């Protein structure tokens, strides 16, 4: 909480402003640091500010002087603690990094970046995220209140009422820190809104109370965080699927409805695992959580390492022990009215992926090849599917690539074998992650489409390992998609229409941008365009997939690396490619071996569709092995015998991406940005040196220089004539002032004229935070609701009923003569007699 | 009104003869503030303190003579028709404005906050203005309703 | 939808085609300069002449040359007198916000880019259904000269303006006229 | 009426060395002359439904001042008559 009444103390420890701020002095605690290119802050001290370059000399280390947007440095204490950040004098993400350690030991993940904010978190909940809060930055809008996750929300809640345009909140990042936690966040500040508000009770539970039912849109993230997030090479979680949740609300701005468009969950990936971490540990729900039962029902049994002694690693946990996600997913459920039988079925198909796969719990003596430790064969595969093939395992364990009818034997290195199993298992646990969209928007959805409505992205980020394939590339290729609008948004269609409006800021870019280089389907990164067109008839000869990549020169900023070849032309050995950070490694087979997807290395037959009917359903459009029959468009579809998607899968994502990207400038987007903790792991310990080469390459540090001089957000002048109740309504002229002058004498005009604001023909572009301040006064006479008005209620009611008694003042007159009378007429008696019976 | 007239004491001369159940003078403290709201002076419970006055029962009595400096500060400051903070003072749960805000949001929120009044005037505020299925409720002509008044000037 | 870049004049015209011809006679078609935006040109059964029209610039004005928004803050006031004069308060100077909708003022919805034609459709039933089912006066006001001057009447205007009316038909039954 | 083409700076925007051209304008508005100048010249167009501006020269920026006038008289006239209908 941030504000809480002494009579609402049942349950909620008080927070007063009277007398005490809760502590009357607020103070600092920071020194000035300067971003190594290694790990961690080392201090120094400024050697000359010329406005807002700044050159820094590190005390025991070096010298610089050159520019800011390469050079990235902690600001002094007072440019500390700010909101907006991308207003202050020294244009860094360094000083949000680093208000945002000190306060991430402190569990406040939220600190500014102008727009956005910035995000380090391990995947899991923490006090802050409680409905407490939530109600006390109501209608505070973006600035007022402490940084926070839900009055970004609030920011983008009005200025989506406030531009005449719809808005979209999204997740821009990369994975390390939370982005699925962070939706929640989003999609719980609708939840209030949507449902209201009349300000926190003088009440809390004595007497068990306190509901509202929105929040079951809220728990649609951790359902979808299970099927989505496990250890990675960045902190305790990363995220590495895409989910695309369309928020819909109505046109009030309550929610009703959610659309889950799932766009891929990474194709691989229990065949293979990362070296001293895991890949993902969320087949391993069911191997330390769920129901156990089941596990050996299915014909899985892994015979326990018994602690390290080296044999794996590959297998090496060091995070805390899987089944982490297992807590999180089954919670939630219940709250969306996500049946108890319906999660058992994604747990059996989610052990079928095992099958064909594992490598738990360390490595087989001479398998060079994906199997179990006990020796099970490929009798489990086909006990869930009934596969047969004289060449089902120990003739897997010889690596075999299979084009047509052909076997090439090309390249293959040793830890990349397990393609000859294949394929099946990669082509079920993407579907299984569909299955999940079927039964969630069952429940949520009460009505659909309609504006307005969030597009929302949280997607994958950077990780390193020589294992990626086919895996991870329409996961990225989201993040290069929306890193290019971060970059086309602030840089390259915000300059064009101040060339479009007679503005006289043109063209103020800081270089590695991207602004629809890479829509190109021809060029999006090289690899993806190769996938595409190959997965169309048997084809799954790699040298070719490495020919046509070793023919692509593409580049100007990260998004390509030249390839190395299985034998002809350039050496073996590990290529990579980049997509908005560093060099992302990559294998020489494995693209059409994780698409055309192989059984056991015998072409299918009817071994495309499973044994039992729950197995039969996942499939739906992904090839097999071999020849492919006619059909499969979008995602549907019910699966063939021999291939069941004619197309590419991966091009009928392309059309959702052709298409986000056009729904995305029918939009107005705030993003959310997530940054790495550091990439050693574990939680706590962050190493802003590996950050701050993360906050270089992705074009962050350029990022928070071009919010200073030019503007991302766009709304209209007449909004300060309109929105408001205190710089609107009588209290301020609206209508008789310039539209422009309301907002100069608040925020000023001393030299804010483009370092505040870029100020257009028919629209000003605000960061979208500058709109917060504004209101910030305006909520201060609004505070009580409303005490100056009660009075006149009673104005009209004593006033008429004085009528009643004004003709009671001459009648006052009239009863004190009559008293006087009463005592007169009884010594004067024989001035009565009336009616009755005594009269003669 | 901003300035006493001589036809708001001429008013009060009258009005003083009400007030003691005699046909005297000696105004009683509720009856305080019945006559500065037949004066065109509303006041709230802590602007009455501030004057001196009183506007409810069982605080200070005064009469005709003493009531002039009490009447005089209300004129200085608001609350004599001026707007600022009525129909300014309400709406924020809405960053729209159509003149309008929520059903629900404009009537437990005068109970919720304020110096908490009837549920029968909370059900005013929402009769006054016009009614869509919408949710959108306008708050800025109940207001107006009460510059048009049963008397815009001196009441009798 | 013109409101938004989708807007195509070439579906304009189809959509012409089949709702005003098939009946009419007087109609002259569409012939569309197939480059860009047209330029193309037809015309309408009326009483008057061919008219060639310019298509273009009708985009732009439904998208509107300044705005909703702009006006919008004129109409509000600082004593809520102002806005009864334009508006209570529901749209026209009071804006519900977001893109999107046709018509308005700011019903529905903020900047929609005024599309009242739209509303015009929808009242245009009401005025003209009523006026169907009543029994005729009439009064066919023809041009006699342009000038607008008794003792000059032109041959050449009266002329064409009875053949469109077709003046043979009209006197046919109103050769018992009352 | 007169005004096209003012792309002349005063504020590092197109606006225009014009005064009492809209000041005539602005004092019967409320809104000052800078208000005015400004929001003329281009309008904010929705392409997808976010803002956009195009490049506007002399006759698209003179047809544009003209966009602000006939809103008005809409506007007004179509209030109008529907409250002196009431009456009648």
Known sequence: ?840 | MADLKAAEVEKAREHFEIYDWEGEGKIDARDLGDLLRSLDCKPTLAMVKKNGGSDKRGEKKLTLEEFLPIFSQIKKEKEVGTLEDFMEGLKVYDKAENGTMLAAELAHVLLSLGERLTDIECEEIMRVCDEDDDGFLKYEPFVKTIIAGPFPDEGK
């Not at chain 1, 929040?215 to 299970?226: H, I, R, S, Y």
């Open chain 1, 1 to 840: 909480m941030a504000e809480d009444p002494d009579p609402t103390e049942y349950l909620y420890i008080s927070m007063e402003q009277k007398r005490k701020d809760q502590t009357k002095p607020y103070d600092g605690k920071k020194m000035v640091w300067v971003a190594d290119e290694k790990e961690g802050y080392l201090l120094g001290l400024i050697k000359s500010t010329q406005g807002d370059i700044c050159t820094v000399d590190i005390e025991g280390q070096e010298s610089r002087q050159v520019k800011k947007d390469l050079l990235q440095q902690v600001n002094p204490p007072k440019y500390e603690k700010c909101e907006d950040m991308s207003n202050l004098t020294y244009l860094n993400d360094a000083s949000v990094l680093h208000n945002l350690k000190q306060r991430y030991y402190a569990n406040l993940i939220y600190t500014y970046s102008g727009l956005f904010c910035v995000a380090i978190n391990p995947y899991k909940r923490f006090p802050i995220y409680t409905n407490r809060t939530v109600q006390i930055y109501k209608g505070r809008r973006r600035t007022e209140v402490p940084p926070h996750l839900f009055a970004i929300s609030d920011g983008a809640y009005s200025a989506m009422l406030a531009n005449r345009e719809n808005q979209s909140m999204l997740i821009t990042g990369e994975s390390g820190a939370g982005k699925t936690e962070n939706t929640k966040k989003v999609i719980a500040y609708y939840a209030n809104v949507g449902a209201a508000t009349p300000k926190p009770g003088k009440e809390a539970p004595t007497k068990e109370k306190k509901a509202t039912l929105e929040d079951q849109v809220v728990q649609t993230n951790p359902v979808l965080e299970a099927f989505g997030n496990a250890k990675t090479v960045r902190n305790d979680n990363s995220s590495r699927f895409g989910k695309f949740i369309r928020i819909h609300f109505g046109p009030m701005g309550k929610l009703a409805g959610a659309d889950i468009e799932t766009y891929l969950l990474e194709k691989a990936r229990v065949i293979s695992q990362q070296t001293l971490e895991r890949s993902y540990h969320i087949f391993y729900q069911l191997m330390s959580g769920g129901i156990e039962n089941l596990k050996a029902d299915l014909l899985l049994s892994d015979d326990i390492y018994d602690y390290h002694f080296v044999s794996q690693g590959k297998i090496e946990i060091p995070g805390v022990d899987d089944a982490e996600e297992l807590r999180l997913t089954d919670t939630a459920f219940d709250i969306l009215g996500f049946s108890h039988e319906y999660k058992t079925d994604v747990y059996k198909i989610t052990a079928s992926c095992m099958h064909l796969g594992e490598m738990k719990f360390k490595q087989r003596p001479r398998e060079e090849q994906a199997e179990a430790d006990g020796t099970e064969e490929g009798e489990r595969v086909a006990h869930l599917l009934g596969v047969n093939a004289a060449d089902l395992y120990k003739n897997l364990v010889k690596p075999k690539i299979k084009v047509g009818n052909e076997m090439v034997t090309q390249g293959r290195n040793a830890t990349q074998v397990s393609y000859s199993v294949g394929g099946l298992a990669k082509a079920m646990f993407d579907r299984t992650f569909k299955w999940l969209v079927k039964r969630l928007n069952e429940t949520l959805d009460t009505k659909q489409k309609r504006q307005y409505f969030i597009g929302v992205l949280d997607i994958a980020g950077f990780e390193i390992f020589d294992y990626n394939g086919f895996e991870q590339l329409c996961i990225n290729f989201t993040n290069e998609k929306l890193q290019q609008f971060f970059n086309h948004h602030m840089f390259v269609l915000e300059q064009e229409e101040y060339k479009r409006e007679g503005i006289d800021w043109v063209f103020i870019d800081f270089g590695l941008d991207l602004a629809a280089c890479i829509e190109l389907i021809e060029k999006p990164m090289g690899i993806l365009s190769i996938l595409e067109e190959e997965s169309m008839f048997p084809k799954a000869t790699d040298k070719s997939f490495q020919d046509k990549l070793n023919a692509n020169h593409l580049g100007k900023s990260p998004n390509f690396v030249k390839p190395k070849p299985p034998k002809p032309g350039q050496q073996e050995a590990h290529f990579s490619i980049a997509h908005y950070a560093g060099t992302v490694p990559y294998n020489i087979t494995g693209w059409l071996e994780k698409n055309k997807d192989p059984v056991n290395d015998t072409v299918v037959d009817q071994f495309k569709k499973g044994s039992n009917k729950l197995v039969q359903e996942i499939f739906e459009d992904h090839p097999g092995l071999g020849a492919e029959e006619k059909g499969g468009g979008g995602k549907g579809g019910g699966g063939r015998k021999k291939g069941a998607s004619f197309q590419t899968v991966s091009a009928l994502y392309r059309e959702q991406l052709n298409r986000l990207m056009a729904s995305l400038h029918s939009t107005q987007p705030h993003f959310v940005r997530c940054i790495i903790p550091n990439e050693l792991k574990q939680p706590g310990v962050i190493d802003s040196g590996l950050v701050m080469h993360q906050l270089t390459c992705n074009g962050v540090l350029e990022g928070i220089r071009i919010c200073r001089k030019g503007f991302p957000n766009r709304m209209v002048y007449p909004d300060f004539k309109q929105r408001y109740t205190i710089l609107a309504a009588s209290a301020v002229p609206k209508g008789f002032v310039d539209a422009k002058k309301v907002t100069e004498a608040v925020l000023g005009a001393i030299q804010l004229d483009a370092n505040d604001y870029r100020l257009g023909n028919t629209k000003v572009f605000f960061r979208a935070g500058v709109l917060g301040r504004l209101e910030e006064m305006r909520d201060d006479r609004l505070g009580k609701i409303v005490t100056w008005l009660q009075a006149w209620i009673r104005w009209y009611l004593s006033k008429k009923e004085f009528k009643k008694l004004q003709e009671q003042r001459v009648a006052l007159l009239v009863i004190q003569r009559n008293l006087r009378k009463f005592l007169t007429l009884r010594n004067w008696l024989w001035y009565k007699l009336y009616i009755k019976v005594k009269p003669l």
